[PDB]
C-alpha cells in the first residue's frame, strides 16, 4: 500500500529531510519504530503539497463545505441528507476533470484501500492545497479501525477541520474515540459549528455552549479550542439575525487556511520535533525491556510479567529521564503489540544514537529558526489562489454636545403639561400622545425603543425630548437609526468611557 | 449564632416538617449528624421566605445586579470598580428603609458573623423574596472558610446566581474551589454572563466558549448548566449588535426567579430528600466504625487504622447497601472531623430507625406528589411582585409567487446588454452601472448586499432583476428591508423547506 496523495537550493525543508535521515531514521530503524507506531518517512512527506482534512458525523456538511471552499462540485462525492459518502475521497488537483479509484498511483502485501477514491479537477485552490473528504462518523461493527486511520492523517495533514451541526448537535462516543486519536495534534484542529443560520439566536447559544462543555471534557487540554460559527453554504440564510458573525468567522477560517503554504515548513519542523520525542520514548521502552530480559532461561515468564508491569515500566522511565507523560503512547496498545514480538531479539540501549536525536532537538533545530524566520518573509505571498478565497466575493462596496438641547425647553413645556408623575411619563400616557402625531404604529414603536434609553417603560424629560426630536425627524422625512449613536444619547445618560 | 434571615391547614410544607421530625431527626440526633454535617432544622427553615444568593469574582456586577432587579439602591452595599463589598449583605424586606449589623435579630458560644449586615427596605419584590449579596471571590489567607459558608447557603437557598463578566473573564482557583462546595446542588445554579454588551460580538463568543469549556471540567456533571448572557444594567449598550439576545435572556432568568414562591414547596421536598440520603450514609459510616471497634483493649491503634482505612470503608459500604458515590461526603474532611470524636461513644447500627427513613423516601414522599401537584395549581399566581419584573417595563408597543416576474423580461434586456459573462455580471460592472442611478453609495451597498443572494460577488439575471426592483423601489421612495423576506428571494434560489 502506498500514497501518491502528497502531490544548490539548501532550504529549511531539505535541512529537515537531511536531519531526519541522519539523526532520527537510524534510531527508528534500530528499535523498529515502523513495526509499532509509524513507518519510515519518504521524500513525498517533505516535497508534497499541504493538505486539509475534513471530518465529522453524518450529514454535518463535510462534502458541502469542501464544495463551498471550491465554488465547484466534487466529481466523486455527492450531497445528500441520508448517509451518502462511504469512502475517503482525496480531492486533489487534476489537469482534466474526473476521478480514479484506489490502486492507481507488487502489493502481495495486500491492500484494503480499495475503498479510497481520488477526485481530480483543474482549480486555482487545488494548485495550492489538497483536500480530503472522509466518511461520516457513526452517531449513537465496521470493517476497519476508524480512529487509527485518523491518527495516521493527524501526523501528516496541515489542518484538521471538525464539523458539528447546530441544527442537531450530537457529540457521540465513536466521535469521542476519534478525538483521542488526534491527541498530540490539538493545534491542527479547527472546530466548525455549521448550519448556525438554521437555529434561533438563543438556541444557537445553547448548542454552542453544550458543544464546548462537551469538548472541554473530551480533549481535556487546558488550552481551549477555537470554534468557527457559520453556515458554509452558498444558499440564503434561514434566520439572518447573526449574519455578520458568520461572515466574520468564515473569513477568520479562510485566512487561517489560506496561509498554509506560507506556513508549511514550520508545521513540518514541529511535527518532526513531535515525532522525535515518541521515537526517543519508544527507544527507552524497548531498551529497558531488553535489559530486563534474561539471557536464555526463564524468559517466557519474564515476558508475560514485563507486559503486566509495563505501566510501572513507563512510570519509572518518566521519572529518571525527565519526559512528559504526553510523550508516551497508549499503554493498552503497547501491551497488545508487544505480544507479537520476540523480546530476545530487541536491541540494547545505545546512547550514541539517542545523543544524536537529543542534539538535533537541542541545537540543530534551534539553529534553523533564524533561517525559517527569513523564509517566512523572503518570498511567501503565494497563498491559496482564487476560489472562495477571492476578495471580490465580498462585493464591490467598501467630541460633541447633544443636538436637541436647543429645542429642549420647548419640549419640556409639552412634557410637564402632560402630567408625568415624579418627572416620569407613563408608557400608557406616552403612547396616547405619540399616536396623536398620526405616524404608523410600527415607526412609533421604533421611536419608543430608541427613546426609552434606561428601558424602564417610562420617559423622563430628556427621553421625551429625544422622542420628540425623532418624531420631528421622521415627520420631516428621515430614516431612524436602527441603534442610537452615542451622540444622540442624553448627556446625563451616556456611558462612562 | 442564629439566623433570622429566613423571613387545620394541613399543607405539604407542614407534612414535610412533620416527616422530618418523625423519621429523620431521630436518625440525625442518634448518630450526631449535627456535629459533622449540618445542625437540626428549625421551623424557620420551613415557614420562611424563599431566598436567592448572588456570587462571583470581584467587580463582576453582583451588587449592581441586585440593584437592577430592585430598580432601587441597596442601603448597605455600594457600587465601585475596586473591591468594595467585604461582608454578606442580607437584602431583605423592611417596613422602613435602613440597615442593621450582625448580632441583631447567650452566645457565649461565640460568634463570627459580626461581619454580616442586614439591609431592610420597603419594596414589592422583597414582599416575595430575600436576596443575599456576598463578598467577591478572590482572583489569582482569609479569616474564615469561604467555600463552607457557600455550602451552608447551598442547602437552604432557592437559586444560586453565579456571575462572570465577559469583559475580563477569569475562572480562578478559589472559584474552582467554591463550585466544589455547591456539588450536589447543581440544579439551583444559574450562570450569568454579565457585561456582554461590552465586548465585540465575535469576542463574546470566545469568552462564552472558554467559560463553558472551563465549567465543563470544574463541575464535571454530564448535565450542562444553563447560562444567561446579558448586561444586568440600567445603562445604555456599549455595542448594540446583540440587543435582542440579552433582553431575551433577561426574561428567561426573570421568569425563572419569579416563580420561586409558586415552586417553593417542591425544592424543600427535594432538599429534604437530598438531606435524608446524606443522613443515611452518615449513619452507616458511624455504625460501621462502632462495629469495627474493640470493646476495651487496643482501640487507640484501631482508630488510627480505621481513619486510614476510611476510603476502603466507604467503598465497601457503597457496594453492599447500593448507594451512589454522589451521596458520600468528602473523605479528606471526614478524616479530619473523626479525629475529634471518641470512637467508643459511637452508637450501634439500629435498623429500626434507618427503616423509617427508608420508608419516608419509598412511600411517604411518593404519596405527597399528588398533593403537591394540586398545590402547584390550586392557588399559586402570587409570584414575585412589581419591580424589574413588571410587564410595562418592555414598553407600550406590542404561499406566494415572486413579485418582479412581471417586470423580469424588461430587466433582462438591460442585463444582457451590459455584457455579463456566462450569465453573470461582475461586481465592477454592476457598480459602475448602479452608480449611474445617482443614488447614495450607502444605499447602493445595502441594495447590493440584499441582491447578491448567493454571495459570490457577481449578479446573475434574477439577482440583477432583484437589484433593479429594489433600485426602483427606493427611487419611488421606500425603505429597504434590513433582511430579504423569503417572498423576495428569487424562486430558484429559495431554501428547501
Ligand atoms: N450549511 C448548511 N446549512 C443547512 N443545511 C446544510 C448545510 N450544509 C449542508 N446542508 C444539508 O445537510 C445535508 C448534509 O449535507 P452533506 O454535505 O451531504 O453532509 P455530509 O457530512 O457530506 N454527509 P456524510 O458524508 O454522509 O456524513 C444535505 O441535505 C444538505 O442539503
Ligand atoms: N452590566 C454591566 N456592564 C458594564 N459595566 C458594569 C455592569 N455592571 C457593573 N458594571 C461596572 O463594573 C464595576 C463593578 O460593579 P459592582 O456591582 O460593584 O460589582 P461587584 O461584583 O458588586 N464588586 P465586589 O462586590 O467587590 O465583587 C462597577 O464600576 C460598575 O460600574
Ligand atoms: Ca425611561
Ligand atoms: Ca451572485
Ligand atoms: Mg459527505
Ligand atoms: Mg459588590
UniProtKB/Swiss-Prot annotation, chains A, B:
Boundaries of every EH domain copy: 407-495
Name the GO cellular-component terms: caveola; cytosol; membrane; perinuclear region of cytoplasm; plasma membrane; recycling endosome membrane
Q: List residues binding Ca(2+).
A: 452, 454, 456, 458, 463
The UniProt keyword set, sorted, is: ATP-binding, Calcium, Cell membrane, Cytoplasm, Endosome, Hydrolase, Membrane, Metal-binding, Nucleotide-binding, Phosphoprotein
Q: Where is the signal peptide?
A: none
Q: Where is this region: G2 motif?
A: 82-83
Query: Which protein, by its recorded name, is this?
Result: EH domain-containing protein 2
- Natural source organism: Mus musculus
